Every structure is written in structure tokens, then in C-alpha cells.
Amino acid sequence: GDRINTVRGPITISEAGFTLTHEHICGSSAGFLRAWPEFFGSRKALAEKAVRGLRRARAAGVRTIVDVSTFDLGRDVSLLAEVSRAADVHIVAATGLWLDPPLSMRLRSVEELTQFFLREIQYGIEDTGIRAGIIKVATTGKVTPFQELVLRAAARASLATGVPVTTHTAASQRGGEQQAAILESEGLSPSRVCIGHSDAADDLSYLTALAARGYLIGLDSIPHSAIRSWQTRALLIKALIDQGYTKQILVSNDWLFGISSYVTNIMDVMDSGNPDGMAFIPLRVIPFLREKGIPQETLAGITVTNPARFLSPTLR
Amino acid sequence: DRINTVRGPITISEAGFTLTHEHICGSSAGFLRAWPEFFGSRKALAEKAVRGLRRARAAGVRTIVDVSTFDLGRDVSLLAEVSRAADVHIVAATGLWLDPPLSMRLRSVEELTQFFLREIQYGIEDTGIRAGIIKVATTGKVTPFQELVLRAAARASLATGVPVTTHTAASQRGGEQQAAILESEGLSPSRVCIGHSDAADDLSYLTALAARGYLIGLDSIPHSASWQTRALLIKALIDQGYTKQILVSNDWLFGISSYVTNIMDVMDSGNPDGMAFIPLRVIPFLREKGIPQETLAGITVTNPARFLSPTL
Ligand SMILES: C[As](C)(=O)[O-]
Ligand SMILES: C[As](C)(=O)[O-]
Ligand SMILES: [Zn+2]
Ligand SMILES: [Zn+2]
Ligand SMILES: [Zn+2]
Ligand SMILES: [Zn+2]
């Protein structure tokens, strides 16, 4: 407690400011940006596009992003440090595993995965020293055996360091419920867990029941509807406020500036559907919520206070 | 006239005794740099590799071909460090093995062709260290994505002259499906090694491929360590007239993360010779069976040189 690790070193919690808690510089695969940078035009072209997009978001009020790219999403932390410095936006890096682990991860025990997540939080990522400030885990269906090991290793690393856990779900399958059961079996407090992609939920009662248990609800992919409207997703934010669960809400774009882990040219399709990029939350969602009558203090709580509480390393 | 190595180009006569299917590390993309303590440390793995390569050099090896691809975790800076310190030539590979990430799996044949060309003609990552071989792995009857990898490999080989080497299940005669695809792209069989052929129960499968001009990779002899029975496949192909089609190797590794933990210790206990197994055990065994030294030198020196020299 008192400081959050970022790609340019520790910051105090008051420095984080407006924080987008689920974003990516680049959605890729381990080793890929280094082995084939011209897939993105060039490494310099991707960095320049990410710096302009982050400066765009900064001019709309954002001061920090949490890049929830794991090892297997190709998360290159040296790129994050470079674009963080050039944009003057803090970036929190992640450990954990997403949905494309290679064999060298897939064959590991829970104890081995715990030591890997442990290494990225406590020592540093690769040979850069940059330490992770969050653990990202993805699951599908009812949670596969390997995904259950990842959740348990994540809980273990969280309990030893205080850094929170954030998840990838299918809300339409109520996937947070299985995640929550596994993480609680490990002794992890719900207040150290964000159940992500909860904006895609059709069932408000699924979200209300997780919030009432203390989970953070990641309404984190609002503009993916702009490519069910985005205003319908944003109304889940108002619904949880009106139910008294403002403190449980985290809002983000889930944007990216380059994508190789999908069909070629998807980034162009996405950018034409959401030209605001990571500024979509502050330029479109926040004004929409204001016009629906949500007061300033509540919107500042969601965008500043809740991420600060969530990211502050806590064992209390 | 020259072959790319991790220390730059060398002339064909420099390659000498060549093991054409080996690995410094069997891992996954990004993994050695993200989690080097899995191997004790990066330094410990490099030290183990240098000890093993120096042992192979003392036994007569002068070059190895490291057929680790991107998705086997190939770390061509590690290869360069241990090539220099062992003073053993290492040829690096492009291509794809059996664990491509989404960023590779979702690519077209044209995109994959550009990636393999990038690693042969420009360099691997930002090291400028060019690949001298293309490695391709397939499973059953060849999946749709594996077929794209073979076609891109054939295209890259036709544009550069560098050869193609494969991973099969010899028990499934996988080289027949591989060869049909490669030939549909116009690739000469003389620029293809069908690997893991030592595991075959069917000599007919190997002789038919050799009769078409394929190189036969009898590359995993010490993994069976009977290894004697696998080595007699070398004699069988010699006796049928196919000496010039034979390539032999150990398929050894100095670290392994792409498998259950501690497999490396099991392997090192069964084969303490490591990469020196071929020169110290297989070559003398074949000589005792009456194969002339000149034939063994052709298999370990001339065939490798003919295969690696870029052609067309
Ligand atoms: C990289 As994603 C679509 O799971 O946020
Ligand atoms: C890395 As292998 C066992 O296919 O030679
Ligand atoms: Zn996700
Ligand atoms: Zn995401
Ligand atoms: Zn193989
Ligand atoms: Zn191999």
C-alpha cells in the first residue's frame, strides 16, 4: 500500500488520477512484435500511433491506463515504457495468462505458474525490472482444468503481493460465477477481483449479485458495441449506480492500437467504428451519463476513487 | 557458395561434420526471456549448451542445424552466444512447428511466405542473423493451417534456395502427405528432408521417399535409448543404394520447457553423450557392421553440405 507499480516505476496512489482499468497497447502473441514488426507497418509506426492515441485520451482527462496484456497477448513492456514516457500517461503492466498460452505455459503446475506470476510482480518482467501491478486471467465456458490452475496461481500471487486480479469472462454465460467460486476457495477477498467484460451481460441480476458480494464489475468494452448499442451497455453503469453499487464499478474501452491475434485488418474496421479510441469513455460515455442525471461526484468516484482503491496493493 | 550461420556466412567446405536436426532449447516464443529461471538461469542454460557442444566438437562435430522455429522459442541471440563459445557453427531456422500462437495461426499463405522470407533474407528479429533452413511440422493427414505452412515454406525455398526440413510421425507415414503438398508448389524433393524418419516401422516408406530424391532424416536415434535397431535403418538405406539420401542427427536439446517438468533430466540420464551420441556411438556401430568410413563421411559431411547449400 501507498504506491502502484507502473512501467516507469512506482507512483503514489494520488498520482494515478482518472484511470482506464482495462486497455491494451497491442493485442498480439508472445515474441511476435519482436519477430515481425512490419506486420504493424513498423515498431516505430505502432509506437507513434499509440502515443497519439494516449495523448488524445490524456487531453480528455485520462492520467493512467492499465494495460491488461499478458505474456501470451504479446505484452512487450519496453514498448509500454516508451509510449508511456512520450505520452505522459502512466501505464500499469499485467502478469497472468489470457486464452493463448503456449505449451511451455500449458504444461506447468499451479506451483510453477504461481512462481511465474510472482516473478513478474516482485522482481520484474523479462530483464527490464518493470514490475506488474495487476494479474490478468481469462476463462471460457465453465472453466477448463488449465484455466482453474491459472485462477488459483493468480489468487496465490495476489495474496502474497497485494496486487489485484482482473478477469476475462463470457458474461452471457455468467462466467464470473465460476471464477468467483474458485478465487474464494483460495481465500481471496472479492474486493481484490474485477470480473471483466461484464458490459456484454444481458442479465443485470448476475452483475448485481456479484457486486453485492464485493466484486468489482468491469464494464470495460463499451465501444465494442459501436463496431446492442453502446448506450445500452452504458446504461448498465447507471443501473448499478441506481442500485447503490457505484463503488463496485470500473469502466474502460478495452481498446488497442495494434492487433495481430485476429484476422488481418481488423484494427482498421475497429478504428473506423470507434474513431475516438481510448477517448471513447471520457468523450462519449461520461457525457451520456451526465445527461442521464449522474452527478460529478459519482463519475469522479467511478473513474478516480474506485481504480485507486482497486490497484492499491492491499492485504486488508 | 555459402550457408548462413548465427556467426554469419560460411563456405560449404567449412561446415564439416554436420548434425542436421538439433536444438539448443525446446521452448515457446518469448518464454526464455520471460522466465529464464525455469532453466535455472539463462547463464546456466548457456553454460550447459557450451559444455555439450564442446563435447560434440571434441568427437568431431563442426556444425549443427538448430531447427527450433519461432514457436519452439528459438532465441537466436542465445544460439550466437553458444556457437561462439563452443566454436561450433549453428544454422538457424525459420518456419513453424506444432505450437503456433494466434498471431501465426490466423495468417494467410501469402503473409506466412513474407515472414519466412523476412527471416531468410533480412534477419531474425533485429539481430540480422539470417535463417539457413525452413522447418515445418505436421500432425495426422496435415491440417488446413499446416498445409498453408508447407506452401509458404515451398514458396520461400523457391525464392531463396534454402532447404525445407520436416517434423513427421513416421508411424503415420506423414512424409507422403507432406511431399505431395510440397511438390504441388513445384519444390524439388532434393530441397526437402523428411524428418523423424528413424521412428518408422516401414522401410518401404523410407525407400520410396529416398527413390524420389527426398532426404531422409534419421534424426532421433538416441531418443530410443533400441537405438541399434534404428541405426540399422541407416545400413538398410545404404544397402538399397540410397547413401546420398541419408541425414543423421540426435535431435538433442540442452533445455526443454515445451514438455512436462524434468523431462530433460530423464533424457540426459538415458543419453549422457547428448549430441556426441552420433559420432561416439552410431558411427562406430555402423563401421563394425562393415560400412566403409568413406560412406560415413559422405553421410555426415557431403550430404549435409549438398542439402544446406542454397540451390535455385
Ligand atoms: C484481448 As480481449 C478482446 O479479450 O480484451
Ligand atoms: C522439438 As521435437 C521433439 O519435434 O524434435
Ligand atoms: Zn478479454
Ligand atoms: Zn482486453
Ligand atoms: Zn519434431
Ligand atoms: Zn527437433
Burial of B94 (0-12, 13-18, 19+ CB in 10 A): buried
Whether the CB-CB separation of B173 and B196 falls below 8 Å is answered with no
How many CB atoms lie under 10 A from the CB of residue B121? 13
CB contact under 8 A, B260 and A39: no
Name which of B107, B124, B260 is nearest A107 (Cβ-Cβ): B260
CA gap B308, B65 in Å, rounded: 9
**Cβ of residue B167 lying under 6 Å from some atom of ligand 2:** yes
B11 in contact with A at a CB cutoff of 8 Å? no
Report the number of distinct structural domains present in chain B. Answer: 1
Using DSSP's 3-state secondary structure scheme, residue A114 falls into helix
Residue A230 sits in which domain range?
Answer: 1-316
CA gap B163, B175 in Å, rounded: 15
Residue with cell 530441397: B191
- Residues in chain B with CB shorter than 8 Å from the CB of A77 are none
Nearest to B277 by CA among B216, B199, B226, B225: B225
Residue B21, phi then psi, degrees to nearest 5? -150, 100
| Residues 6+ positions from A176 with CB-CB distance below 8 Å | A167, A169, A195, A198, A206, A210, A215
CA distance B222 to chain A (A): 23
Chain A residue with the nearest C-alpha to that of B94: A35
User: What CATH number is associated with residue A156?
Assistant: 3.20.20.140
CB contact under 8 A, A126 and B261: no
B118 in contact with A at a CB cutoff of 8 Å? yes
**What would you report as the CA-atom Rg of chain B, rounded to the nearest whole angstrom?**
18
Task: State the Cα angle at B207 between B206 and B210, rounded to 5°.
Answer: 90
B89 is in an annotated binding site: no
CA gap A250, A72 in Å, rounded: 24
Residue with cell 553458444: B82
- Residues in chain B with CB shorter than 8 Å from the CB of A32 are 29, 101, 103-104
Task: Report residues near ion ligand 4: CB below 5 Å.
Answer: A 254
